[PDB]
Design a protein around this ligand. Structure first.
Ligand SMILES: Nc1nc2c(ncn2[C@@H]2O[C@H](COP(=O)(O)OP(=O)(O)NP(=O)(O)O)[C@@H](O)[C@H]2O)c(=O)[nH]1
Ligand SMILES: Nc1nc2c(ncn2[C@@H]2O[C@H](COP(=O)(O)OP(=O)(O)NP(=O)(O)O)[C@@H](O)[C@H]2O)c(=O)[nH]1
Ligand SMILES: Nc1nc2c(ncn2[C@@H]2O[C@H](COP(=O)(O)OP(=O)(O)NP(=O)(O)O)[C@@H](O)[C@H]2O)c(=O)[nH]1
Ligand SMILES: Nc1nc2c(ncn2[C@@H]2O[C@H](COP(=O)(O)OP(=O)(O)O)[C@@H](O)[C@H]2O)c(=O)[nH]1
Ligand SMILES: Nc1nc2c(ncn2[C@@H]2O[C@H](COP(=O)(O)OP(=O)(O)O)[C@@H](O)[C@H]2O)c(=O)[nH]1
Ligand SMILES: [Mg+2]
Ligand SMILES: [Mg+2]
Ligand SMILES: [Mg+2]
Lengths: 290, 336, 284, 285, 290, 290
């Protein structure tokens, strides 16, 4: 794999990407936080091949957390084989064993929607081990279901973990500050006002005026949302994904196309953001259309 | 029986708890204001999302969920009738904090004297929270929540909920409720005012440093080092700045609201605080007495016993911003 | 396209939105034929009236990831991993890639949709469908075995707008789902034509639409408490007249007491006079 | 049976118009209305053949679950076997006789969680989605060879009570699938007075007693919040004690005042002995 | 092993380290409470070598409590064999058997994030037995799953226990005060003020002016944090672990490095910390850059 | 078993120990209800030998309850063999059986931390027999797991039950219904203002006035605890055993030794107690230091 392969279709600046790869080599654990629709899931599979430098999915594992996800499934626990119960080494436990075989090559474990599941319960023993300075046999730990103290589990040094956490829901947030220290948090923005996003549109037979008009609209729109941090922080603001997909047929992005998409998706979305003000909903809708 | 206009009272609680337009509501009485705060306040939380705390559940189910407890499993022999004892984490809004809101709304609706709109809208909201379980509220429940894992916003409405429950009295009927006559008693009004200033001064007087200071008597006793019999003396507030220190004692009195004799009994406490207090910096020593008045504000200064002391009042019922302006005007004179 | 009481624009909108985006939520009050819309619509997209492709389920608060996708459940001998329907269903559509298989989701609002779907909450989006985006599930013993939604799959969810829950709002799922409102359609000729094609009186039909619309506008009057989402549907009128009993005010008045009155009670709770007024309004 | 029923004839006839079409129904009312006896006679009325075999009855509670109701695994001497529940057995029995209407009684339905018990089936019981078209594989039905569908003949009755103020608003699940009917106590009804006048009761004693309870039922419903229309007392207690062989009398009434109404009146108010003492003494004379 | 080797790099005052030994040796069970990043995990492995006087891990055991540890895992529980269950002595029971094999040499059992789990549930019978007074054969007690033949389990005197309760999660704090008497709680400060912290940076090619500039700012922030108690208490104040790491390659500390720290880790932390006004965030973030 | 050895060292007034012996012969089911650190566990071991009048371990049994403790272990239950299930007589069942042989001799069962487990879930059916009046073979019952009804169990009259319950948690406001009927609660004072506690310090070379100064602080502070009911009742107040411990060397009491206790036990305990008002913590901490 190579760097330039990713950047061709990526709307995020390279400078942030350099910051991303810089920390991850150091901290070995990262979390990318932004609103939905900015390619967190998109980059994460790409970024892995960058860090390894080779397109190996064997070395990469990608999972999505949720409420009913637990230490027993993730790490270790007793589960039914059949008539007889057995201890089933979870996916993360097995992932490290593969990585142990190949210490040189980096192995990556990717957690989508991390903030949902109770991470404190899930990681558990891992919460201490995963830190960059504590990896290796020297900090070996026995697990809950380990037969004895001698059976011990150590995270390899090579492992890199990437977590994806939306900023739309304040209920589900990584409030456990001890857990926050392990992860280096990298905010991501929609990146409307970028050449790469614009070049993709112009590449898709788009008017230079209409594209630039659109960028002002969303950028100003997001700025209004970020202002009222009491109700809605910057994390809530709209992503670029609604505009990204759906143009595969070859339809040029005219104003008629824009008027359609806002009607179906953004309009009701705005209603919840501004429940009390119908005028404010009507104001911003009309601003895009006019 | 004249008292402060009720709308202004709510602002004093804001500083009291340390954290909107009140012109919209037409009901002068307090519970109309406070009920509207909660009824509207709940809506802000719901938009962002209510607190969801993972409560572990250990129950007997037809399958494996999370971690099986081997001990309880075999002892109940649930394996044979296709059941297991397993511990797992249902994600609910059934927290103690959220139950208080729903239980509180019942009391708000049950209050006999209330605006029709307020009671109507909440009953929908009461209906809108089906999963949560009603509770019979006591202060001990609020006491348990002093940990404050919840956000800063949650603590605001709960602080209101603490106010309402304590200031709720059963009225004409066994079921319904009646609001407390908060205004008439000075003591709760007084503790509010002392608390109102103490947290208020932290906000606005960023220039100065403000702390409540405990003081120890200059006395020595042959009998006891403890001096337990001697009164405990704890300042209401001290607002120290590099150029000058200042100690304040403020209280709410009904007689002083009348424009005759004057109630300055608290002053006896104030001087004695000045004497036992010795400043290491030795910049200056100043004193203030401030009381609530309704009609107008008057400021005086004194040079009493070699100390520079001010007695002043504030025209409550005027306007909340000018009152906010009024205090900053006040303290600047004496803080010098 | 004949007995549907919704305008042709909405159904024409839906198929273009659905085929492109591949996920949609049809939200409206009860009694607007959400089921009949979806079931008819599914047969259009396949092009054949084949129900085996189509599967419908009705969510409820107790439904869980154990049932939907995967789960550990007991056989007669003991415990095993039992494939939930959607795991079972996508495998079925994966069997035949060319044809279009449909999954219908009723009573979606009740359950914590994130909790149920879990892993597939990412996978369902149209771009992220295929082996490249596959993931091992929670209960999969080995990472190598994975689950991926195929491109052929299309998902429809039917949501009641009249039971708002101030518990969980997810705007990320809203990114996956393209939301479509449905109006009751009293104004539509197609509903009126059916009544006129059931030997109804012309004035009675015109009087009927005015009666419901005046109430419907009242329901949408106070946006704060209630909205267009609450307003009454037409479907109560569809049933019960296929025996041969043509419409009459007596039959309508029966429905007023039979069906509408609890709804009114439910909606205008602790307001007898307004129910008494609006109930009596229809009878007049 | 029709004259034997004490409730208005209009209510009796009206229900069958609802049930035949809707196929799902719930009666919410005070205790002591003959709700159990009502449904049975009404169930026999719909079939017309007075067959108890067609009708099956179940009483819900919080523990009642999908395994009891539908299907589950039960222990053998060694191991365990799949064990058909009531409703699964019930419908398959009715499947043989399509023309024959079969009725199912779920008592104290509001106590249990409908979702928890039914599960999958909760949509299949709604009349619009019925029959082989809407077949679904069951939770423990490992194979896809056989699916569970309730045939059209099935009618579902739910017995719920409006007695308790502790009960909050009804579950949303119920409201969609069920038609809600309230049954009056029926004191005013002639059929109840002819059930006392046939037993040689004095018309004054009869009419006074009917007037006596009506004033009581009106006052208990006067309360807006705590005691509603549903609280008001039913008539079934009056049946109990007369047709065994003992004639009506004020002393027989006096026992019943102490028997049920006096503790019942305590339950509803549960606050004031004087107000209870007023009514309890007033009922006697 | 001796104090000289361990305290070469450690940023803690000597005062606590000996004071720790004063309370521990008499009391034998302690908890060190501080925010994450103050070396709680770091010292604990080192302390084991002092009291034993030698660097041996065998007399040491290290574990972490993840809100799913149980008495079945800690002490005595039932595990599946191929077809049927058997009774398994847990790690702690296994640990005491080794420790009571020789009373002379001290044995340590270490519990990270001890505050999380419901400790009363896990320890059970031990909650009495851990205490210094009630040790030895005199206070032997029979366990839950003990055999009918009388066999009793007693904490040997040589055992010393250390707990690591982070101060971030207030909810997950010891409110079972009966248990809080068994332990002696030793507060650990962030560790900024000490010169022993300062020397570590200066030895790694750092200017004292830049160091003294940095440390001045942190205490102001922690003072700003220390002032509040409603949400952000005294304990939340920032640790020094962030600054420890990432300098091994030879990269000297400068504002570029500090700027990476401030934007990347601390700045997300601050907005979560305050989450009332952004103005408070921008001031203090900019202070560090200034 | 002479009283002078037993009761002289004890801090409690002779009034309470005698009263304890009265109800214990009468009712035989007794609960000592007080905060931690008043010797609840301490006294019960001595009292058992007092009533029997001799030091015999066999006649006396000790247990601590916790959530995992159950009927199946306590009384009777089935423990799996390699595959098969064997019934096993539990402790309390086995304990009484010894008492049957020697009916004259008094037998004692000691239950620490009783509130944690529900009495019904553990005792269950035997709560019927456990009652003081309904003892002896007349009220015999056949057990749940008995193969036949012929086999029966009756609580012999000779056994007396002692249960130690701590009023240290808020949850215990809802006391279990089972305890109140069957047990006789006794309140145990903290026991600072007592003669024997004072003389113990004086015997360990302590200044009398400083001790009297200390007691007034504890007596004064504990009063502040008792006045509140919402957060801290009378039952929460400090016990007298922090100071008892730690003097086995002979180290004299002083402000430094006091400060060791204050910083390491009582100061952070107060942080948990008086969270809402940090200054209220400051108010007392400085008071004790003086
Ligand atoms: N072609 C292209 N698509 C992009 C780019 N960035 C984002 N997208 C698209 O936006 C959609 C969502 O990507 P995703 O990472 O899941 O966004 P997200 O922020 O993770 N959403 P969520 O947080 O809700 O999971 C996909 O269609 C993705 O390909 C891009 O740079 N190029
Ligand atoms: N070199 C050196 N590193 C230190 C010192 N103090 C802390 N650290 C470093 O800071 C990082 C984390 O320390 P750690 O003990 O895990 O803190 P913790 O309190 O245990 N973490 P947590 O509270 O999250 O469990 C490690 O790199 C650790 O070595 C120190 O004095 N010297
Ligand atoms: N010498 C002496 N020690 C006492 C006296 N009272 C209590 N202690 C000591 O206090 C320490 C703990 O006593 P203990 O009974 O365990 O208190 P507890 O009620 O069991 N504690 P908890 O409630 O937390 O379980 C022991 O050293 C005990 O001997 C006493 O009167 N004399
Ligand atoms: N002919 C016709 N029937 C309809 C229409 N809408 C609904 N129905 C019928 O109304 C009955 C109930 O529909 P249902 O799905 O339960 O209502 P909903 O789920 O709340 O939308 C079925 O017979 C529907 O087919 C319609 O637009 N035209
Ligand atoms: N013969 C006859 N008995 C009735 C009638 N109505 C109620 N009953 C009797 O009243 C009793 C049932 O009352 P019910 O309310 O169902 O008892 P509950 O379920 O405990 O509330 C039985 O004795 C019924 O036969 C009736 O109309 N005719
Ligand atoms: Mg995404
Ligand atoms: Mg650590
Ligand atoms: Mg004890």
């Amino acid at each position: 794999y190579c760097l330039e392969d990713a950047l061709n279709d990526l709307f995020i600046p390279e400078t942030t990407i350099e910051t991303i790869l810089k920390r991850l080599t150091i901290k070995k654990n990262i979390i990318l936080q932004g609103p939905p629709g900015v390619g967190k899931t998109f980059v994460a599979r790409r970024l892995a091949y960058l860090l390894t430098g080779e397109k190996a999915p064997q070395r990469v594992n990608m999972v999505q957390f949720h409420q009913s996800y637990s230490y027993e499934d993730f790490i270790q626990g007793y589960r039914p084989n059949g008539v007889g119960f057995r201890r089933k080494d979870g996916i993360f436990y097995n992932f490290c064993q593969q990585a142990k075989e190949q210490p040189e090559k980096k192995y990556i474990f990717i957690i989508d929607e991390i903030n949902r599941a109770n991470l404190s319960k899930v990681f558990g023993e891992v919460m201490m081990l995963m830190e960059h300075d504590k990896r290796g046999e020297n900090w070996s730990v026995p697990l809950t279901y380990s037969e004895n103290d001698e059976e011990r589990f150590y995270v390899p040094e090579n492992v890199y973990i990437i977590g994806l956490m939306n900023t739309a829901d304040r209920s589900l947030a990584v409030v456990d500050y001890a857990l926050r220290r392990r992860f280096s948090f990298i905010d991501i923005e929609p990146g409307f006002d970028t050449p790469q996003f614009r070049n993709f549109l112009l590449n898709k037979k788009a008017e230079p005026s209409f594209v630039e008009s659109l960028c002002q609209k969303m950028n100003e729109l997001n700025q209004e949302i970020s202002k009222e941090a009491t109700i809605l922080g910057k994390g809530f603001r709209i992503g670029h994904s609604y505009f990204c997909c759906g143009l595969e047929d070859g339809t040029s992005p005219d104003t008629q196309w824009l008027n359609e998409i806002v009607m179906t998706d953004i309009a009701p979305l705005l209603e919840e953001y501004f429940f009390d003000d119908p005028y404010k909903q009507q104001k911003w809708t009309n601003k895009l259309l006019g | 029986q004249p008292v402060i206009p009720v709308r202004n009272i709510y602002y004093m609680l804001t500083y009291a708890w340390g954290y909107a337009n009140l012109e919209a509501i037409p009901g002068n009485n307090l519970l109309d204001i406070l009920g509207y705060v909660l009824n509207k306040g709940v809506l802000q939380l719901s938009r962002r999302g209510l607190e969801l705390d993972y409560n572990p559940n250990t129950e007997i189910i037809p399958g494996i969920k999370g971690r099986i407890e081997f001990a309880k499993t075999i002892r109940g022999f649930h394996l044979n009738h296709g059941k297991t004892v397993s511990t797992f984490d249902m994600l609910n809004e059934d927290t103690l904090a959220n139950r208080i809101i729903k239980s509180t709304l019942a009391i708000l609706i049950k209050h006999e004297k209330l605006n029709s709109t307020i009671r109507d809208e909440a009953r929908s909201l009461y209906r809108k929270l089906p999963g949560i379980s009603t509770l019979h509220l006591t202060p001990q429940h609020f006491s348990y929540l002093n940990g404050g894992k919840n956000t800063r916003y949650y603590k605001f409405v709960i602080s209101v909920c603490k106010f309402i429950v304590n200031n709720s009295i059963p009225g004409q009927n066994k079921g319904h409720y009646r609001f407390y006559d908060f205004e008439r008693n000075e003591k709760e009004m007084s503790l509010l005012y002392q608390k109102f200033l103490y947290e208020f001064c932290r906000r606005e007087l960023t220039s100065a440093n403000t702390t409540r200071s405990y003081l120890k008597w200059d006395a020595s006793s042959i009998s006891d080092q403890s001096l337990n019999l001697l009164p405990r003396m704890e300042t209401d507030i001290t607002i120290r700045s590099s150029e000058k220190i200042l100690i304040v004692d403020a209280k709410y009195y009904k007689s002083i609201f009348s424009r005759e004799k004057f109630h300055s009994q608290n002053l006896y406490q104030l001087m004695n605080y000045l004497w036992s207090l010795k400043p290491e910096n030795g910049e200056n020593i100043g004193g203030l007495l401030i009381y609530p008045h309704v009609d107008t504000a008057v400021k005086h200064r004194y040079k009493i016993n070699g100390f520079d002391i001010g007695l002043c009042t504030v025209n409550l019922g005027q306007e909340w911003p000018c009152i906010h302006q009024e205090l900053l005007d006040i303290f600047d004179e004496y803080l010098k």
